């Protein structure tokens, strides 16, 4: 966590404005899509196993 703190402290505008926000948005979108797909598969397979 020290590296992240240093990156956020020393670089306040060069990183937070562009690099951090886009990476976080991409990660959250990918994780949401994965969660939706996994939930759909789990429901379908739960009905199948029922």
């Amino acid at each position: 966590e020290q590296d992240g703190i240093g990156e956020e402290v020393l670089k306040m505008s060069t990183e937070e404005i562009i690099q951090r926000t886009r990476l976080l948005d991409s990660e959250i979108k990918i994780m949401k899509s994965e969660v939706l797909r996994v939930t759909h598969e789990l429901q379908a397979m739960k009905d199948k196993i029922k």
């Binding site: 992240g4 703190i5 956020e8 402290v9 306040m12 505008s13 937070e16 951090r20 976080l24 990660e27 959250i28 994780m31 994965e34 969660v35 996994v38 939930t39 789990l42 397979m45 739960k46 199948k48 196993i49």
Partner: protein, 87 residues
């Protein structure tokens, strides 16, 4: 005026907390999938196993011709029976 460093640190902390919550949800879903994968494997193994039949066990008493065997089933009734080709 709040320092930009403080704003960036607070935003990073909030994003990290949200990421940790999403990671906890992902871990819960992964545990569910791990358990249900073995559960479904056992379920499908059982369902496949349900459709299968037993073989009467009996003793061969003589080989009449190349494809004729006399078999005395354990209960006692004696049959004249064939033989699978690859045996």
């Amino acid at each position: 005026m709040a320092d930009p460093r403080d704003k960036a640190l607070q935003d990073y902390r909030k994003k990290l907390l949200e990421h940790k919550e999403i990671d906890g949800r992902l871990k819960e879903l992964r545990e569910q999938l791990k358990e249900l994968t073995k559960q479904y494997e056992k379920s499908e193994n059982d369902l496949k196993a349900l459709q299968s039949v037993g073989q009467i066990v009996g003793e061969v008493l003589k080989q009449l011709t190349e494809e004729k065997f006399i078999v005395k089933a354990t209960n006692g009734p004696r049959y004249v029976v064939g033989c699978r080709r690859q045996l």
